[PDB]
Amino acid sequence: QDAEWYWGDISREEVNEKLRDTADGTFLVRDASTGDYTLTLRKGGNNKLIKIFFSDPLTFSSVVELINHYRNESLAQYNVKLLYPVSKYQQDQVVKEDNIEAVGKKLHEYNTQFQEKSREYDRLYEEYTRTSQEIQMKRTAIEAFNETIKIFEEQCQTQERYSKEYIEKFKREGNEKEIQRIMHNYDKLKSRISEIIDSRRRLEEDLKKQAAEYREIDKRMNSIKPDLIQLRKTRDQYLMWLTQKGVRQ
């Protein structure tokens, strides 16, 4: 019960978080979720589960004998060694208030600060998503501005090709009004293209600014995410200390 690797009544998911991204040999023993005991050993990126009875007739009198023997001995007899224990007293620190009222008051501080940061992270994620969507909308509209300008430029080419051959016939005819009506329609077409080009230009600047706005929202979320994880785990430690230092059923 006083062993560092024994955690008692803990779920299998709590062991996954504790053995998350650990090296080969990290182990801890817990009460089997039902057997009686189950050893979880990190090896090859997987949290191996090993029942404790543990194979064939029993060769060890106690569980403390089974752990300490195998740490030095290695587990090859069954089929790495138990190199690294997960001490239960390692997290006994960071909960230093040491009395029932100091903890709980500190838990109220941590839980409050956690709800502040949680609402800050949520609203930042809504700006993050809204900016990602509006950036995608502006890129599509720039794609449509590209195709629209191509079409109106094709109208200039088509007008130029068909004209000139007609305007030189109107010059020998002496009809200045027919020349003025062709040039007036060409000025109307070119001015419209200048308006569409300037519209795409302003849309590219709004996208250029909104891309940098997305870039800073992404940095802010990458900075508050680590602080939000540790603040929740600190709150859960002070809460766990409060349940342990309280009446148990």
């Binding site: 991204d21 990126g45 599509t140 629209t148």
Partner: protein
């Protein structure tokens, strides 16, 4: 790209009544023309050429009949408008201009590609631009399924086309539960057959009593006292196949509720001639020295070169690095390998990473999962690692070639709530958005192309084995049990259901063990479809395993259960490594041979086309479906354009008119809905909640804007069916724009599955899983319950107010039926909400019918949503039965917990809770198949562990009943024995 909004112009949700249009004539001239927003292109082209005579070079212009309009769509497409009967406001123009051109190319092929691209929400021409050889191969190879289905659709007479359009909606088994048979009169049922005579359409009533399992032709024969067909009065449901009458879902439901089954007799030619003839045609794109993997003699190594940029400020983060790992599904094949830590502003590595896995030992489904993480020493000795962007790569391609050479990979944003450093559940491939962090890579070269070996080149006693096969998919399996399953791998054939347990015992990092497991699944006997679905989730990615699971569904999965679990079967499509696989071929085959299946097959895919992670895969699949679905593409486009005008209308209400009163928004609603363009779209189309329901004329007097901030629309339609009075005369649907309805859709699906499990076991616990369908990004429809009211409405402060309200409505001899219905509905929802962890209930969540039937609404949150926000870990009782409900169950008696009625109510809860616990593998598999859908409360298997707690799977069945009994006592403070 997809259209940014549903408005009529870019930046303009709604065109003004008149609008100037720049008309680009084919002579170079440009004519500004004022047009009405609802004017057709025929009218606009005639008005244009009448004005073009007043502009220069008009002698060059030909007849207007020789021209069509072309313009830039909001989807950036250069669309040609061959359908000149379309209104200007329906063209989805990016800007108000039209270019006059002469039609060229294949006209009919361009018209079909336009209609397909409209249903999918994406121009089909963008698939032609894809350079990926796998994408183009999928478009050509999948046409085999399209041809095989259309040939099977007209292999037979119009009856085959009728079985496609109107399939039989029947149960999976002809047998009847003994609590269903006891409602029959000596095994016979009283039904009413109606006939509509030829002149004046006079309806005649024919009550007749026949055997419950009478084939539909037998029913017709009794009515005569013979080639006709039967139809449900009020909807498009037909009794075409020779199933027993009781097996049809409509008749089976009538026997339950004691309602009278009203059918209608019509001639076979009345429906056979009404059916159009679907003709599928081949598209345009269909016409236009290697070493082995086991020969390579080296270990695996991958080189991380550089990353273009990373969005992190150097003030808060110390350094950055690239974390990698080889995965077979969700488990690594070797320990993860990291790169050396580099500064944030300079993300370059040029580092080879050595994985301790021999290359011939790599399995077929091997995948490289990597990410760019940030490390911060920060406080104390421990440091914080946070992922910034992730990416997954299939180490082999669809050709089976091993990856080699340099490779640039654009990474994805980390999903919200995901705190792991890697994301092996995410999709494979590069990010289409090239404005993202790009990671340069390089795989080693073996002087040739490396290919995967061919199938020819690859070669306690009974108990405890049984005990393991009955455990739930997420149960703990020790290494001693893995060595026990692998050593007994040949005896497991007698218990074929243990195959998922055996596959997880295989050392997939061992070429020797995988070679032997392939030969076992080659001759493995079939398993039930409910169990083969597990082999299609993310934990089983092997092609031979997934192929075996698909073959089980091809032979043993009825269309009833296929429609029931279609949501999950669509979700596991994104777990696939490649576009072409047996699963996508099986689903597309069934969707093209059953319009009830293809209807929801279409909408489940269309609803996720906004998601850039699956938009390419779902777009290519929707293309092949719409290419061969026949005349139903016309009906689907009517549903789509109706949903587009609802989206556009609700967008206006919560953006430009958000700061206006209810009366102003209602006046804008009734004025806009009465326009001709709006009336043509939202009248006369099939309901997306149930394609058997025809939505007729809108009843604008009944349409309302609900008082929620999302402004949900309460819409009402007439039933154009000749006999609407026998089913429902009005069809009421709630259109919601703003809230994600995927969790509601899944929960209501689970509720229906739980209710079916109860009915088959003789438990008549009546649930109400109303329709709910997500149609897009936070857009969906919700079925309205006809005569229901929330508990708050009933109260509007005595506890007996609810019981006295049920005394009315059901006054007289129908009182015991209302109390019985209220008790049985409470029992089902008390157990269902406890197992699923639904959000807490209140006077606004709980509704009651005039029937006495109780049910819940707004299943927004499931499982352990509160554990992350509040450290306490408890299994909540969301539906605590107040004294108001207890008085109703006890018929007004005080001391309700000790009455005879409450004790019988407890038996219903215990029977239902244990019944669902016996089918725990089904629900755990259904939740597991959704881990990649992106729903926030279903990201990992730890989120599924909540129903393992509520169902108490790690205990005995007797202990689990004590656990459920204590949970009820803790929430109700006592009274549960």
């Amino acid at each position: 790209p997809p259209r940014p909004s549903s408005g009529e112009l870019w930046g303009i949700h709604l065109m003004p009544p008149r609008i100037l249009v720049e008309c680009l004539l084919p002579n170079g001239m440009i004519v500004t023309l004022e047009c009405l927003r609802e004017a057709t292109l025929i009218t606009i082209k005639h008005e244009l050429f009448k004005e073009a005579r007043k502009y220069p070079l008009h002698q060059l212009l030909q007849d207007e009949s020789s021209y069509i309009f072309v313009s830039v769509t909001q989807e950036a497409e250069r669309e040609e408008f061959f359908d000149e009967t379309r209104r200007l406001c329906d063209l989805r123009l990016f800007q108000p201009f039209l270019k006059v051109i002469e039609p060229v190319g294949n006209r009919e092929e361009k018209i079909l590609n336009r209609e397909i691209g409209f249903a999918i929400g994406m121009p089909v021409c963008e698939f032609d631009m894809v350079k990926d050889p796998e994408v183009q191969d999928f478009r050509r190879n999948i046409l085999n399924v399209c041809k095989e289905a259309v040939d099977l659709r007209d292999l037979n007479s119009p009856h085959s086309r009728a079985m496609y359009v109107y399939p039989p909606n029947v149960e999976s088994s002809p047998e009847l539960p003994k609590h269903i048979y006891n409602k029959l009169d000596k095994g016979q049922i009283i039904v009413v057959i109606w006939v509509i005579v030829s002149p004046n359409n006079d309806k005649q009533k024919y009550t007749l009593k026949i055997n419950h399992d009478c084939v539909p032709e037998q029913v017709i024969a009794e009515a005569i006292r013979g080639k006709y067909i039967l139809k449900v009065c009020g909807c498009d449901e037909y009794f075409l196949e020779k199933y027993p009458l009781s097996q049809y879902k409509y008749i089976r439901s009538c026997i339950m509720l004691g309602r009278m089954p009203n059918l209608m007799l019509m001639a076979k030619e009345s429906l056979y001639s009404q059916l159009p003839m679907d003709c599928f045609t081949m598209p345009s794109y269909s016409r236009r020295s290697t070493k082995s993997l086991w020969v390579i003699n080296s270990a695996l190594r991958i080189k991380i070169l550089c990353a273009t940029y990373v969005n992190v400020n150097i003030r808060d983060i110390d350094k950055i690095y690239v974390r990698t790992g080889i995965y077979h599904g969700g488990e690594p094949l070797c320990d993860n390998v990291n790169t050396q830590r580099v500064p944030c502003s300079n993300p370059r590595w040029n580092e080879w990473l050595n994985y301790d896995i021999y290359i011939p030992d790599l399995p077929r489904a091997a995948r490289l999962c990597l990410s760019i993480c940030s490390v911060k020493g920060r406080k104390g000795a421990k440091e914080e690692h946070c992922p910034l962007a992730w990416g997954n790569i299939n180490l082999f391609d669809y050709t089976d070639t091993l990856v080699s050479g340099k490779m640039a990979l654009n990474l994805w944003p980390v999903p919200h709530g995901l705190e792991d450093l890697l994301n092996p559940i995410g999709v494979t491939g590069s990010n289409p958005n090239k404005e993202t962090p790009c990671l340069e890579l390089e795989f080693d070269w073996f002087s040739s192309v490396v290919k995967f070996p061919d199938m020819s080149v690859i070669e306690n006693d009974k108990e405890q084995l049984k005990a393991i096969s009955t455990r739930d998919p997420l149960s703990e399996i020790t290494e001693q049990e893995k060595d026990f399953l692998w050593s007994h791998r040949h005896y497991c054939v007698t218990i074929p259901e243990i195959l998922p347990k055996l596959l997880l015992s295989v050392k997939w990092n061992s070429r020797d063990e995988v070679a032997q497991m392939y030969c076992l699944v080659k001759d493995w006997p079939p398993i039930k479809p409910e169990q083969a679905m597990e082999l299609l989730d993310c934990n089983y990615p092997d092609p031979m395993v997934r192929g075996f699971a698909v073959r089980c569904l091809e032979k043993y999965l009825t269309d009833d259960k296929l429609s029931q679990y279609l949501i999950q079967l669509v979700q596991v499509l994104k777990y696939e490594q490649y576009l072409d696989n047996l699963l996508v071929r099986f689903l597309l085959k069934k969707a093209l041979t059953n319009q009830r299946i293809g209807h929801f097959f279409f909408w489940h895919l269309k609803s996720e086309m906004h998601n850039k992670t699956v938009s390419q895969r779902f777009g290519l699949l929707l293309e092949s479906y719409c290419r061969a679905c026949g005349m139903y593409l016309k009906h689907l486009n009517r549903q789509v354009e109706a949903m587009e005008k609802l989206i556009n209308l609700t967008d206006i209400l919560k953006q430009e008119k958000k700061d206006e009163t209810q009366k102003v928004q209602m006046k804008f609603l009734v004025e806009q809905m009465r326009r001709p363009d709006f009336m043509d779209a939202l009248q006369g189309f099939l309901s997306p909640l149930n394609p058997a329901h025809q939505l007729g004329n809108l009843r604008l007097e009944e349409c309302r804007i609900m008082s929620s901030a999302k402004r949900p629309l309460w819409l009402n339609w007439e039933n154009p069916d000749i006999m609407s009075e026998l089913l429902f005369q009005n069809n009421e649907i709630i259109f919601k724009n703003g809230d994600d309805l995927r969790q509601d859709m899944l929960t209501l699906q689970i509720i229906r599955i739980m209710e079916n499990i109860w009915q088959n076991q003789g438990l008549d616990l009546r649930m109400l899983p109303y329709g709910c369908l997500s149609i897009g990004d936070c857009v969906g429809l919700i079925e309205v319950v006809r005569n229901s009211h929330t508990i708050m409405q009933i109260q509007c402060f005595n506890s007996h107010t609810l019981h006295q309200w049920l005394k009315d409505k059901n006054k007289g001899e129908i009182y015991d039926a209302a109390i019985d219905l209220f008790t049985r509905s409470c029992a089902g929802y008390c157990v269902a909400t406890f197992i699923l962890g639904i959000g807490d209930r209140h006077n606004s969540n709980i509704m009651v019918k005039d029937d006495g039937q109780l049910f819940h609404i707004d299943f927004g949150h499931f499982l352990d949503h509160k554990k992350k926000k509040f450290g306490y870990k408890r299994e909540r009782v969301p539906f605590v039965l107040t004294q108001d409900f207890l008085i109703v169950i006890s018929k007004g008696a005080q001391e309700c917990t000790k009455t005879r009625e409450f004790e019988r109510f407890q038996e219903m809860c215990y029977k239902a809770y244990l019944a669902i616990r016996q089918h725990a593998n089904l629900f755990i598999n259904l939740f597991s198949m959704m881990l990649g859908s992106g729903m926030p409360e279903l990201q990992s298997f730890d989120d599924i562990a909540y129903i393992r707690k509520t169902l108490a799977l790690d205990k005995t069945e007797q202990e689990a009943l004590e656990y459920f009994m204590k949970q009820m006592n803790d929430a109700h403070h006592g009274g549960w024995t």
